[PDB]
């Protein structure tokens, strides 16, 4: 029993973190086989960062401009290129700790683990969701650029996120490992604003199901509403609309607890309209929206309490 924000074990990713230095700029890189991936703005000085032309800046560099360190051992660069906003450095040694891996791009509302790194050295691990406005609410200080987010599926690491920058609101933006930004952001030091965020409804429902699985029941009721009637209260409280395909993935949770999805939606409606009246759910005093249906299944028991 119990429910925690739970990250994937980070060892397979720790074996891949290196430090990339170009001039006076230093950040983290991801070393898979004989390629290091890092944010391309490692090639920018302080002035370049304001309005950079990256094709120009890269053409003025050669392999010797790039210092790659895996611990103390230095990797010599034998090639470089640009793929959108990530830099690729070909090195002369294939990372022998390279796990099975894929580059995947995730959807708003999905979660992943973040290995925060500084100077090529892992310092912490945590769980994150991709917000509906394509930012993440991470924990990153200067020098964390190049930290990656990932999911693990049977010793295969699916890399979904590379960290590039913090926005004015303190939230974080980056790319997939092909260098394509999540959301309407660009890698230059200008003030950029995310769109307005919304609450991930299917995740809140999944987390209510985790509550029931763990014995928290006070918020339930006998009422039921219809799909379209709920979606009206959603829009009022700035929640995502619920789809019949979202209901379907919530299916296994519905079956295991015996509580139909639309039944649980009525309880959510009531929680939105009346608040919690001082009580808590799974140790929280607000509705949590960063656990997916998959996250609930994998952490919770297979049998309801």
Ligand X SMILES: CN(C)CCCCNC(=O)C[C@H](Cc1ccc(F)cc1)NC(=O)[C@@H](Cc1ccc(Cl)cc1Cl)NC(=O)[C@H](Cl)Cc1ccccc1C#N
Catalytic residue among 22, 38, 41, 265: 41
Tell me if 141 contacts ligand X by CB under 6 A: yes
Which residues have CB under 8 Å from 183's CB, separation 6+? 133, 134, 135, 173, 194, 195
**160: annotated active-site residue:** no
Nearer to Cl ion, 88 or 97 (CB): 88
Short-list 155, 157, 211, 163, CA closest to 185 = 163
By CB under 6 A, tell whether 107 contacts ligand X. Answer: no
Q: How far is the CB of 77 from ligand X (least distance, A)?
A: 22
Cα 169–Cα 38–Cα 141 angle in degrees, nearest 5: 35
Based on its alpha-carbon atoms, the radius of gyration of the chain, rounded to whole angstroms, reads: 22
Cβ–Cβ under 8 Å, residues 10 and 115: yes
Which residue lies nearer to ligand X by CB, 57 or 272? 57
Binding mask 157-186 for a second copy (x = CB under 8 A): ---------x---xxx--------------
Residue placing its CB nearer to Cl ion in the complex, 61 or 88: 88
Site for ligand X in 183-202 (CB under 6 A): 187-191
Q: Mark 235-264 with x for binding to ligand X (rule: CB under 6 A) and - for no binding.
A: ------------------------------
Question: Is residue 123 a contact residue for Na ion (CB under 5 A)?
Answer: no
Nearer to a second copy, 25 or 299 (CB): 299
Cβ count near 184 (within 10 Å): 12
Task: List own/partner pairs for 252-259 with CB under 8 A and 24 or more apart.
Answer: 252/293, 252/297, 253/206, 253/209, 253/213, 253/293, 253/296, 253/297, 254/209, 256/213, 256/302, 256/303, 256/304, 257/209, 257/212, 257/213, 257/304, 258/304, 259/209, 259/212, 259/220
Distance CA 294, CA 299 (A): 9
Q: Is 180 in the site for Cl ion (CB under 5 A)?
A: no
Residues 6+ apart with CB under 8 A from 229: none
CB-CB contact of 204 with 261 (8 Å):
no
Closest approach of a second copy to the CB of residue 227, in Å = 28
Do residues 267 and 219 lie in contact, with contact meaning Cβ atoms separated by under 8 Å? yes
Q: How far is the CB of 252 from Na ion (least distance, A)?
A: 19
Say if CB 42 and CB 27 are below 8 A apart: yes
* Options 22-30, 83-91, 124-132, 179-187: segment touching a second copy (CB under 8 A): 124-132
By CB under 8 A, tell whether 141 contacts a second copy.
Answer: yes
Q: Which does 88 bind (CB under 5 to 8 A by kind): ligand X, Cl ion, Na ion, none?
A: Cl ion
Taking CB under 5 A as the rule, which mask of x and - marks residues 220-259 in contact with Na ion? -x-x------------------------------------
Out of 9, 71, 79, 170, which residue is the one contacting ligand X (CB under 6 A)? 170
Chain contacts with ligand X (rule: CB under 6 A): 1, 41, 49, 140-142, 144-145, 164-166, 168-170, 172, 187-191, 214-215, 305
Catalytic residue IDs: 41, 145
């Amino acid at each position: 029993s119990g429910f925690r924000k739970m990250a994937f074990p980070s060892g397979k990713v720790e074996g891949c973190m290196v430090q990339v230095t170009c001039g006076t700029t230093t950040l983290n890189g991801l070393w898979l086989d004989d390629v290091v991936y890092c944010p391309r703005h490692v090639i920018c000085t302080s002035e370049d960062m304001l309005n950079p032309n990256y094709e120009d800046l890269l053409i003025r560099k050669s392999n010797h401009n790039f210092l790659v360190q895996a611990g103390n051992v230095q990797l010599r660069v034998i090639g470089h290129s640009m793929q959108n906003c990530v830099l690729k450095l070909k090195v002369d040694t294939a990372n022998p700790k390279t796990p099975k891996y894929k580059f995947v791009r995730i959807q708003p509302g999905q979660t992943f683990s973040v290995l925060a790194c500084y100077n090529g050295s892992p310092s912490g691990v945590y769980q994150c969701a991709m917000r509906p406005n394509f930012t993440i609410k991470g924990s990153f200080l200067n020098g964390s650029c190049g930290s990656v987010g990932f999911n693990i599926d049977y010793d295969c690491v699916s890399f979904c996120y590379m960290h590039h920058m913090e926005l004015p609101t303190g939230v974080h933006a980056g790319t997939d490992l092909e260098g394509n930004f999540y959301g309407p952001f660009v890698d230059r030091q200008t003030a950029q604003a995310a769109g307005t965020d919304t609450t991930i409804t299917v995740n809140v429902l999944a987390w209510l199901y985790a509550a029931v699985i763990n014995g928290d029941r006070w918020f339930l009721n006998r009422f039921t509403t219809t799909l379209n009637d709920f979606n009206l209260v959603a829009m009022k409280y700035n929640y995502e609309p619920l789809t019949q395909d979202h209901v379907d993935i919530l299916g296994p949770l519905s079956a295991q607890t015996g509580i139909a999805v639309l039944d649980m939606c009525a309880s959510l409606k009531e929680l939105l309209q009346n608040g919690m009246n001082g009580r808590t759910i799974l140790g929280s005093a607000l509705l949590e929206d960063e656990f997916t249906p998959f996250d609930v299944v994998r952490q919770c028991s297979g049998v309801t309490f």
